[PDB]
Every structure is written in structure tokens, then in C-alpha cells.
Design a protein around this ligand. Structure first.
Ligand SMILES: Nc1ncnc2c1ncn2[C@@H]1O[C@H](COP(=O)(O)OP(=O)(O)OP(=O)(O)O)[C@@H](O)[C@H]1O
Ligand SMILES: Nc1ncnc2c1ncn2[C@@H]1O[C@H](COP(=O)(O)OP(=O)(O)OP(=O)(O)O)[C@@H](O)[C@H]1O
Ligand SMILES: [Mg+2]
Ligand SMILES: [Mg+2]
Lengths: 49, 97, 246, 233, 198, 84, 148, 49, 212, 49
């Protein structure tokens, strides 16, 4: 993304800027209990990567 | 088989002949020549599909007659319209014969 | 949307052209005239204004199109005339800002055939003023007077809102041109200038360029930093330690 | 480490292949004499394909060479590359440089130019195996490839509402026949790219602007008379 | 005078060695990183330098470099043995597709020995050893010996790289294609190579 | 060269004269007129090539057209004449 | 004295030409046609017939003119088809003698794209014989064959 | 050289560079006289060396 | 300034390498040919750029050497980039005899033209005939077939020396030939009146000669 | 140089009092004798003599 839209997008996505896109979010539900090694606040988003 | 043959058309040479005969008067009288007016008057005598070739040939004949002294003024010439459908020409008036 | 366009090309005091301006077409412009009329001269003017680097500029004849450097003459000197000469381009961006870019050319006196070149740029000019008018004085004589850069700077600074920038290095000139969208890539270094000139001159003479063909990957593929900088940072602690030990 | 590096390399390679494939389609069905199409053929070198696969899946067989802290990562890459294909020689150059070469994705790709000539299939474009006009047309094709690639590269450093100008030349254009010129005009028009062509009057393209030149001697000095025409069509 | 880039090229420290090798007839492949890069960089001038000797510097379409002498060659010429070409053609055949899974690029002397024996005609074999020889142990032994010999020759040519140990196991380089057949549109390499071998 | 060989040659033989020029289209009408008069004054034969018929009123001319035909290629040749 | 002249040029089994004969002019002969028609090929055949020295012959593109390239391929092989080929010239001597010079060309089987040349000369041929017919045999219903 | 330069047209670099060799013919009379002198000058070279 | 020959090479060396004589000479030199005073072109060339050539060839780990008699030749080092080889003992016998023939004022009247028969006669006059015959064949005892075989081996070795540049045959007659000063290298073991062992040691140390 | 070599001592010593011609100059051309700057090779060019 260009420098002109960069500040807009960074404000829009806020803390979730560095989340992961995952199109279902139910396939993670079994994996999730295992996450003991991760940032204290993990963000997940659904959509076509 | 035996070699065949094909022939050329002289329509453009005839066109050059009419234009040069029509234009010779300007030099003989040393009359100032303006491409805009001449092209506008001369294109009216032929149909649209042939205009481009007529314009080219007329310019080829006209430039041999003298020069335009205005060219050394540093002032560009304008784009004059010469027919409908939107054809344009750019040239200073020919003064020095 | 609305790609930019080159609008016109102006020559002043070149061989055969005291003051001439060509209005470029949006798609195709065709130069036509008998042998020796001066067509290649106009293209020489265009490219020299575009890339004012005397190390690269070499206008070899179309015959012998692919030979070595050969002579020490670059073929440019003879196209100028005694005194001061100019070559300028007029451009319209997607923003519809009118910018005029060009160079000033002069024959350096001596036994050898050498040339002196200085780039410049003008912004904010009114749409009512043409380059030929800026660069000439309509003195009483039959023929006007071409005015040097000093007179030009004084004349331009008098205008309201018009800015005249005069460059000391080619790098700055290319940087400004890129920022305004006149060229597709910002010529970081001399190597970039060389490749850009290769592109232009290969297009000019025509044919499958040997140099383009050799280094195809160098031309068609962008260089990616992501794969590298991680490992430069991770490698840093070892690099410093090794240097300290030495 | 290991797999993730392989994945980023693979994705970069895949993206480059796809972009090339998109550029490639714009050049289909271009008629230049007997040439009917042009392509940029992209392939992956074997000696690097096997290395990439090994780094992806056999990492437990070489982990000793990767986690040994006496040598850095790029050095590890160079040493692994020499372990495979042992016949390769090294020109007394530092393993660090060979490592950084392995880190650069472009080194994994092999590039060619091909043309679909006449009754034959896809052939590598050699100048000596083409007529004059075919060579000129192929050159123009590759040049527009370069220009499109460069514009895609730089747009991430340019304003969102800026579109650079594009212009190319052709000297002694009389060398091309009418059909080839029609093809070239179609290409440039579809690419929004300007052209300046020089010809000793032999060609009269109806579209665009034309300038007539005549050199004369006036007051014992050389002078060029210029006339212009445009708007036809 | 002399072209500047030519003087630069032959001033390089790598030139003497490469010169020596080249004159011997060695082929430079993509394996020799530095030499191959050097040739890629200075080809335009090295071709002219060697033309002064009535010898041609050719870059094969596969990528490897080599010298070809003219009739008027200034460099003393030498020629290969029939057995030599035989072996060479063999190696070109072994540069196959199943090779990758069969040997992972590393062969042994026995592979070539047995392939040679199996694929060739008896008569030509005899011609290679001595026409009076007849299917004898000693003959086979001598043939083995010759095989080794010629193989070494080839290694000098750069065709084949021995793995660095005393045992006779090696890998085949791309430059072996010089032995190969003419390729026509759609033709299968195995078939054409065998057709010449026959 | 012709002059040089005057002695060795038999008295009665004047050697043939012939030259070429590809991409003749690079020359304009005046230049070609000059070239033709030069070569005819010297009894010199010429063979020239151009995409378009640049010499309509002098010498002979042939027109070549290539046709793809049953998975091979064939060239068709037809002559041209100044007037019709 | 009457200077000698080149009467005609004949091509057999070239790339695009099966058997074609161009009749030259006393002063100027012009070849026209779109790109790739075969004009430069005709030039090359003539020159070949003139100077069969294989060492010399090097047909570069018109672009890249004047660049001493040492190209891998001299560009002649591709202009020939499989089988036997010819290129011949008919000349009228100052003595009013008809003489037929030429070459037999043939591709070499093998990876290297090499070519074979064999010059020849014919004297005293009757004026009624055309080279196109002399070099071919009429086999079948107007389906002639070339002969070695 | 001659033929090829004509075919591609233009000022051939090789022709002009050696124009003496191309245009000026050789003379046998010059040679016959020079034979004697040739012998003498060879001998002088010998001595010098 | 940049892009200037002097940056990479001395002007005189580049001037030498650009000469039309260089490829011939180079080729020959590498092949082991000795260069004497008679082949003027070559000799003169050598003289003009001696030091540049020496410096050049040094790159190869080979010495371009100039004997006192005025003849040039190549001597490879132990680390040589170019292979090194040794002459056969029969070549030495013919070499030392050719040397004595060159010196002999008694035959100077021939103007340098000698015949294979005269060479053979001189050789058998000095060396042990029957013991030398052992090299031709282990059973040789003076039979004419063996004497003709010896003569043919001599003819052959002489032909090899001709290729080294040590002797030149006549333009039309091959049974006769002329000597050159390059033959004096066969006297390297005796030109100084000192202990033969020490001389031999010195020579092997300098790389001039090997034992057998 | 042809005048220098052609005209000999005994008769032309009265002519030699001109500043341009002398005998020693023939040996002075020994410098030019060693190597002229010839470029392209065919047949056999060698030296001033
Ligand atoms: N460096 C130079 N020195 C001297 N005269 C020159 C130089 N460059 C060009 N000229 C002359 O300027 C005139 C115009 O040359 P130019 O190359 O522009 O012609 P042109 O119209 O492009 O011709 P053509 O299309 O036939 O090549 C010619 O007389 C040419 O001789
Ligand atoms: N060596 C070759 N190998 C394969 N095809 C070739 C070879 N040489 C020429 N051709 C093809 O033969 C056809 C004739 O080419 P040629 O150059 O003779 O045509 P032309 O009419 O002279 O064209 P132009 O005027 O554009 O030069 C073209 O398709 C060219 O691609
Ligand atoms: Mg031009
Ligand atoms: Mg052609």
C-alpha cells in the first residue's frame, strides 16, 4: 500500500493490524487450547487470503 | 507456371500535375501564400476519403516556393482548421520568394 | 487514471533550427523529409534532454548500428551551433500540472569537439506563455537574440508563482522528474542510468537488442529485500564479533 | 528457520511467475511477418529446485549444519549447497557471498524469449534466424515488457493518483510493412504509449500528427522549413 | 593500440589458468562458477583474442564454453580415439530421466562398463581391442583397462567429474551433450541417441 | 581492380560488374535517381530490395508473397510493370 | 567491346522456394514484398553461388550491421531444406559464350548445423535449355523431382 | 569484403581503414630492382643484430 | 584517468601483444622451440620487448631465458602452469655430436651444410659403437640390419631436433641440413672447467636438467 | 629519406650543406627500424627498411 493510504489503514485496523487472516475460524477452535506460546493478544480474521 | 503481371495506377501523379499547375501563379505574381486558405479551398474539390493525400501533395508542392520570414520571430503558429470532421494545419505565411 | 502525456518539444539554435517547437501527438507523431533533412537530429535533441549524461550519450550512425565505441567523437558536437543552445520538454501530469524540463547546451572551444550541458526545470508557468518566447528577446534586428541562463533566471523570478530550479547534478534532476511522474523509475545510480539509456537507444535503432537479451533477468525482475534483511539483522551479532577479533 | 524460508521463497517465485503470465497474455496474436506470438519463458533451475525441496523436508538430516553457532546462516546455506551437487567448484570466493547469492530469489529463475514462427512451434528468438522486420517487431515487444514491469515495480513508491508517461522511438521506420505498422499501432494504443517514428516519406500513417521537413540555404546559412498536419481519420 | 576491455580481461588473475585449460581443450560448464562468470563477462573480447589464432570460441546452447580449431589452427591439434567417441555417446545416453531416481547423479565405473558391453556390437568391440581377439578373459580385462584410460581422458576434457576419493565413481556434466544427436521437432532423445549408437 | 588486371587478361574480355543494396527504402527519390545514373554510366548491374516498390519506372521488378500451405511454406512470385 | 552480363539466377529446394528462376535486368533489378517474403534469402543465394568459401559466409541481420559478432551460427543452414539443393548463375561472356556456374548445397546430418558445398561449371549448353528443367526430372503427373 | 559491404551498404569500417591495400596496385618492375637491395638490407640487419 | 590502458597494463606490453608476430611466436615457444639469430623477424621481435615478455610469462610460473649465444627459450618452474618434458639419451648423443660439428673449423668450409652420413660417421668415430648399439637392440652385435636400424633411429631423432629448432633441412634436399647456435645447450655440463658433480647439481637445482 | 639514401658522399658532399639531409640519419632510422605501429595483419609488413 502507498504512503497516502498507509495512515488511514493503520488507524482503521488499530490493534488488529498484525492479526492473521483465516477463512473459517472454526478449524482453529481445536488447535487453540495448545497456544501457550503467542503474543498476549492474538487477532484472527476471516476472509479470502 | 509462367509468370503473371500487375500494373500501377498514375492517379496520384495526375493529382500532382493539377496542383502544381494551379499553384504556379503564386510564384509568378509573388503573391503571399497562406496554406490554411489554399487547403480549405482545394479540399472542397475532392471527396473526404482522398483529402489526406491531397493535403500531403499540396504541402509537398507549396514548400518549394520561398520561405516564411516569420519563422525567425520565435512565435509559434496556430493550428488552422481546413475542413469539417476536424482536420488541422500549422504553417506560417510564405513571404520571401 | 488519466495517464500523463508529453505535450511538445522545442529546439533553439541547433544546426538547421534557430527556434522550432513540435506539438507531439497523443498516440503517434511522424517525422518526414528527404535524406539529411534533420529527423534524427530532432530525436537526438529529445533523448539528450531526457538523459543529460555525456558518458552515455553516443549518436552513432544508423549504418554500422552495432559496432564498438570506435572514434572519440560522440557525434553530438556537430549538431550544435556557435553560441547558446537549448532543448526543452513540456509535460502534463495526471494532476494536470504544467512542468517544463530542459537543458542548456554550448560548444566548448578547443581543438576537440566537446560540449557543455546544464539541466534546469520550471514549474507553474501560465498556459499562455510558450518556451520559444521565454528563451528569446525580440530585438530590433531581423532575428531574435537567445538569452543565457542569467537573463532567464532574472526573467522567470519576476513572474508570480513561477519557480525556476537549476540543478548541479544529474541525480537531483532525475529525482525531481520521477517525483512528478515523467519517468517510470527513479534512476538511483549510474548503473540505472545506463540501463534506462540502453532501453531508449535500443528502441531508437530497432532490432533484438544484444544487451537486453544477455541480462534478461536483470531487466524484467524486481529485486526483493524481504528475503534478506531478516538474516542481515540476525547475522549482525556475529559480524561485529568477527570484526572485533580481527 | 528451514521450512518458513522455503515458503517465502516459493511464494515470491509463484507471484513472479503469475505476473509474468499476465504480461505474457497481452502479446498473444501479434503479427510480424511470419511471427505470430511472443512469450517470456520462465523456469526453475534444477540445482536450486532440489535444494529448495531439501530445505523444505529433509531438515532433520542437516540440522547440524544449521544450528552450529560457529558459522552464520548464509554460510550454512552455502555449505548445504556445496553438499548437494558436489561437483560444483567455488572460485576462492567467501562462502558469505555465495550464501547471499542463494538468498536472492532471482538466481533461482531461468529466462528465455520465444516466438511462434510460421508452421513451427515455439522457438527461441535468435536474431540470425529472423528477417529484418520480424527482428524489429520482436524488439518492440520485449521493450514494452520491460516498461510494464518497471511501472509495476515503482508504483509502491509513487502517489496514488500518478500515472507515468510512456514513449518510445523508431528510426528508419520504412523497414516495416503496412501490416506490421498496423500491429504496432494496435499495441501502443492498447498500452496508452506514445510513439515518434522517422521515415523518408515512404509511409503515411493516417492516424496521428505528421511533420514535413525541408532543409534550405538562406542568407548563406542552413535552415529547416517545417509544416504540420493532423486530425485525419 | 588494444581495446580497453580486452586489456582488462587478460590482465585479470584468472586468465592464465583459464588459457592453459582452454588450449588443452577443456570445456567450461556452469559448475565452474568463477571461470564461467568470467567468460560470460568478457566473451565479446575473448572471441576476438582467440580468432587471432585461427581458433573459434563457442558457447554451446546448453551453456558451456569450448574452443574449436579451424584447419589453419595455430595451436597444435590432436584427435580422439573411436573408443573415445563410443564412451562419450554412452555417457550422453546415461544423462537420462530415470538417472535422477536411479543414482542421484553419481555413477560408478561398473555401470558404464556393463552398459558399454551390453549395448555395443561385438565386432566393433574387437576392433577396439584387436581384431584377432575373441571373447576371452584377457580381452575383457584389457577392455576394462582401456575404459578406465579413456574415462580419465574425458575427465581431462571436463566431461566427467570424479568424486574425490580413490574409488572410481563419478558424475556427468551437461557438457557431455557435445556427443549427442541432432534433435528434430518432437523427437524422443532416447530413441535418437540409441539410433546413433546402433 | 579492373585496371590492374589489364595485362593478365586477354585483350577481348571485359569482366562482369554487379553490386547489391539491401533495405533500399532508406534512400529518397533524389538519391536513387543519382545512384541509377551513376551505375548506368559505368555499365554496372544492381540488385536492390525494399518492402515497397521504390523504383517503378526503371528496370524489372518482382513481387514476393509467402503462403502457409499444408503445414509448410511456399513463395509466390509475380512481376510488376511501369504502366497499365 | 561488349561487357559481360548476368542473365539469371536459379534456386532449387531453398526455404520457401522449390524451383524458381529470376531473370535479371541489364541495369537494375528490384525485389519487393512484405516482411519475411524472402528477399534477403535471394541475395544470400546469389552471394553463396559467387563465393562458396564457407569460412567467409556470414549472413547477419540488417540490424546489427557492422558488429563483428562471431555468432555461433552463420545463418546459412536454416535457409536450406532437407535433401539436395542448388544455386546457379547463367552468364553471357564478352565472347558471347553462355556459361553456367553454380554450387550443390546439402545439409549435414548431426548436431552441428553444418553445410556441404560442391562447385561446378557447364560450358556449351544449348541456348534452348533452361536450368530449372535441366536440374529436375519430370516424375508423375507434373510433380517433378530433383536429381543429384 | 567488397561484396558484403555493398550488401549491407554504407561506409564500411574495414574498407576505409586499409584503403591503400584496396586501391593501389602492385608493380613487378619495382620488385626486380628491389631484389638486390633486399639482399643487401637483410645482410645489414644480420650484422646489426 | 579512468578507462586508460595504463590502469591495467604497461603500454609497451600491450603494444607487443597486439603485434601480428605474437600468436605464431607464442604457439611455438610453448611447444619448446628455441629461437636463434637466423629467423630475423622473430628474433628481433624478442629483442625489442624482452622484459615485457619475461614479465608476462612469469604469470605462468615459467622463465623466458636468453642464453649467452643469443638464443631464447622457455624453462618451466616446479610449479609451472605449462607441462615440462625431458629429452632421450639418444637425443643427447646426437645433440652433443651436433655441437662438436658446429665448433669444428675443419668442416666450416661446407658453409654449414652437413649430410646424415657425415653425422653418423662422426658419432661412431667417438662413442662406443657396439655398446651404444644396446639401445637399438639388446642382442645387437654389429649386424647390418641392426646398423640400418640405428641409422633410421638417428634420422628420426634428428627430425625431432629439427622441430625443436636445433637444425634446418635444405629447401629441396632432405639428406642435407644446417646447424644453429641453439645446440650449445648440450654443452651445459662442461662449459666451465670444474668438478662435473657440482656442475650437475647446479644444473638440476636450476631446473635445466634431470637425471634418468 | 629517399634523397638521403640515394645521393652519396663524394659527389653530393657539396650538396649536403643543406640542413635537412645527412648520412647519419640512415642509422637514426634504426629507431624507426625496430617496430612501426602497424595494426591489421595480412601478408607480411615488417619495418621501415
Ligand atoms: N555531427 C554532425 N556533424 C556534421 N554534420 C552533421 C552531424 N550530424 C548530422 N549532420 C548533418 O546534418 C544534416 C541532418 O542530419 P540527420 O541525421 O538529422 O538527417 P536525417 O533527416 O535524419 O536523415 P536520414 O533520415 O536520411 O538519416 C545532414 O546534412 C547531416 O549531414
Ligand atoms: N536461418 C534461418 N532459419 C530459419 N528461418 C529463416 C532463416 N533465415 C530466414 N528465415 C525466415 O525466412 C523468411 C524469409 O526471410 P528473409 O529475410 O529472406 O525475408 P525478406 O523478405 O528479405 O524480409 P525483410 O525485408 O524483413 O528482411 C522469414 O520468415 C525469415 O524468418
Ligand atoms: Mg536519419
Ligand atoms: Mg530479409
Amino acid at each position: 500500500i502507498t504512503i497516502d493510504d498507509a495512515p488511514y489503514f493503520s488507524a482503521l485496523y488499530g490493534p488488529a493490524r498484525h492479526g492473521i487472516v483465516v477463512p473459517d475460524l472454526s478449524l482453529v477452535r481445536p488447535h487453540l487450547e495448545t497456544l501457550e506460546d503467542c503474543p498476549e493478544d492474538l487477532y484472527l480474521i476471516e476472509g479470502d487470503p | 507456371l509462367e509468370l503473371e503481371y500487375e500494373e500501377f495506377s498514375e492517379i496520384n501523379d495526375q493529382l500532382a500535375a493539377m496542383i502544381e499547375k494551379a499553384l504556379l501563379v503564386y510564384q509568378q505574381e509573388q503573391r503571399p501564400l497562406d496554406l490554411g486558405a489554399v487547403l480549405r479551398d482545394y479540399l472542397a474539390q475532392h471527396p473526404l476519403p482522398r483529402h489526406f493525400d491531397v493535403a500531403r501533395i499540396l504541402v509537398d508542392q507549396a514548400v518549394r516556393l520561398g520561405v516564411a520570414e516569420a519563422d525567425f520571430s520565435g512565435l509559434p503558429a496556430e493550428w488552422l482548421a481546413i475542413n469539417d470532421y476536424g482536420a488541422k494545419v500549422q504553417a506560417h505565411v510564405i513571404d520571401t520568394y | 487514471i488519466e495517464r500523463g502525456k508529453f505535450r511538445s518539444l522545442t529546439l533553439v539554435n541547433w544546426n538547421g533550427f534557430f527556434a522550432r517547437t513540435f506539438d507531439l501527438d497523443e498516440l503517434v507523431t511522424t517525422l518526414s523529409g528527404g535524406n539529411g533533412a534533420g529527423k534524427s537530429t530532432t530525436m537526438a535533441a529529445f533523448v539528450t534532454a531526457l538523459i543529460p549524461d555525456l558518458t552515455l550519450l553516443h549518436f552513432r550512425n544508423t549504418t554500422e548500428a552495432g559496432a564498438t565505441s570506435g572514434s572519440r567523437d560522440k557525434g553530438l558536437h556537430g549538431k550544435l551551433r556557435a553560441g547558446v543552445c537549448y532543448s526543452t520538454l513540456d509535460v502534463i501530469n495526471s494532476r494536470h500540472q504544467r512542468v517544463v524540463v530542459g537543458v542548456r547546451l554550448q560548444q566548448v572551444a578547443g581543438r576537440d569537439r566537446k560540449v557543455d550541458i546544464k539541466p534546469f526545470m520550471i514549474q507553474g508557468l501560465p498556459t499562455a506563455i510558450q518556451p520559444t518566447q521565454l528563451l528569446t528577446e525580440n530585438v530590433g534586428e531581423r532575428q531574435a537574440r537567445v538569452l543565457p541562463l542569467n537573463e532567464l533566471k532574472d526573467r522567470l523570478d519576476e513572474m508570480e508563482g513561477v519557480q525556476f530550479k537549476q540543478f548541479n547534478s544529474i541525480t537531483d534532476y532525475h529525482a525531481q522528474m520521477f517525483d512528478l511522474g515523467v519517468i517510470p523509475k527513479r534512476l538511483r545510480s549510474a548503473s540505472d542510468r545506463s540501463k534506462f539509456y540502453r532501453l531508449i537507444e535500443a528502441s531508437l535503432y530497432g532490432g533484438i537488442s544484444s544487451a537486453i537479451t544477455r541480462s534478461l533477468r536483470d531487466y524484467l525482475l524486481p529485486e526483493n529485500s524481504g528475503v534478506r534483511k531478516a538474516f542481515q539483522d540476525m547475522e549482525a551479532a556475529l559480524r561485529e564479533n568477527r570484526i572485533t577479533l580481527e | 528457520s528451514s521450512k518458513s524460508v522455503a515458503n517465502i521463497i516459493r511464494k515470491t517465485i509463484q507471484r513472479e511467475q503469475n505476473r509474468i503470465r499476465m504480461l505474457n497474455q497481452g502479446l498473444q496474436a501479434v503479427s510480424f511477418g511470419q511471427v505470430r506470438g511472443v512469450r517470456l519463458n520462465v523456469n526453475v533451475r534444477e540445482s536450486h529446485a532440489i535444494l529448495l525441496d531439501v530445505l523444505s523436508e529433509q531438515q532433520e538430516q542437516h540440522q547440524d549444519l544449521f544450528n552450529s553457532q560457529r558459522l552464520t546462516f548464509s554460510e550454512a546455506m552455502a555449505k548445504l549447497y556445496q553438499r548437494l551437487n558436489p561437483q560444483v567448484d567455488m572460485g576462492q570466493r567467501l562462502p558469505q557471498t555465495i550464501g547471499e547469492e542463494l538468498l536472492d530469489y532471482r538466481n533461482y529463475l531461468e529466462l528465455d524469449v520465444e516466438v511462434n514462427r510460421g508452421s513451427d512451434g515455439w522457438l527461441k528468438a535468435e536474431s540470425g534466424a529472423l528477417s529484418t522486420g520480424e527482428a524489429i517487431g520482436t524488439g518492440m515487444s520485449i521493450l514494452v515488457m520491460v516498461v510494464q514491469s518497471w511501472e509495476e515495480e515503482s508504483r509502491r513508491l509513487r502517489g496514488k493518483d500518478i500515472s507515468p508517461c510512456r514513449l518510445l522511438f523508431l528510426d528508419e521506420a520504412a523497414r516495416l510493412d503496412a501490416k506490421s505498422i498496423a500491429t504496432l499501432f494496435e499495441l501502443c494504443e492498447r498500452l496508452q504509449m506514445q510513439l515518434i517514428i522517422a521515415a523518408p516519406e515512404n509511409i503515411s500513417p493516417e492516424k496521428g500528427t505528421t511533420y514535413k521537413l525541408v532543409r534550405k540555404v538562406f542568407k548563406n546559412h542552413e535552415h529547416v522549413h517545417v509544416v504540420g498536419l493532423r486530425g485525419f481519420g | 593500440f588494444m581495446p580497453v576491455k580486452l586489456a582488462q580481461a587478460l590482465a585479470n588473475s584468472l586468465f592464465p589458468e583459464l588459457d592453459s585449460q582452454l588450449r588443452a581443450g577443456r570445456h567450461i560448464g556452469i559448475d565452474d562458477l568463477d571461470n564461467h562468470a568470467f567468460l560470460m563477462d568478457f566473451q565479446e573480447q575473448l572471441e576476438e583474442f582467440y580468432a587471432r589464432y585461427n581458433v573459434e570460441l563457442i558457447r554451446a546452447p546448453e551453456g558451456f564454453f569450448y574452443l574449436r580449431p579451424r584447419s589453419t589452427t595455430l595451436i597444435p591439434r590432436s584427435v580422439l580415439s573411436e573408443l573415445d567417441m563410443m564412451v562419450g555417446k554412452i555417457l550422453c545416453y546415461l544423462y537420462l530421466s530415470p538417472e535422477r531416481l536411479a543414482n542421484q547423479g553419481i555413477f560408478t565405473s561398473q555401470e558404464l562398463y556393463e552398459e558399454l558391453i551390453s549395448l555395443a556390437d561385438e565386432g566393433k568391440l574387437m576392433k577396439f581391442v584387436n581384431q584377432r581377439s575373441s571373447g576371452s578373459d584377457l580381452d575383457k580385462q584389457k577392455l576394462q583397462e582401456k575404459v578406465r584410460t579413456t574415462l580419465n581422458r574425458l575427465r581431462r576434457l571436463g566431461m566427467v567429474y570424479f568424486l574425490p576419493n580413490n574409488n572410481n565413481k563419478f558424475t556427468i556434466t551437461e557438457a557431455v551433450f557435445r556427443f549427442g544427436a541432432d534433435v528434430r521437432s518432437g523427437d524422443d532423445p532416447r530413441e535418437i541417441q540409441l539410433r546413433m549408437i546402433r
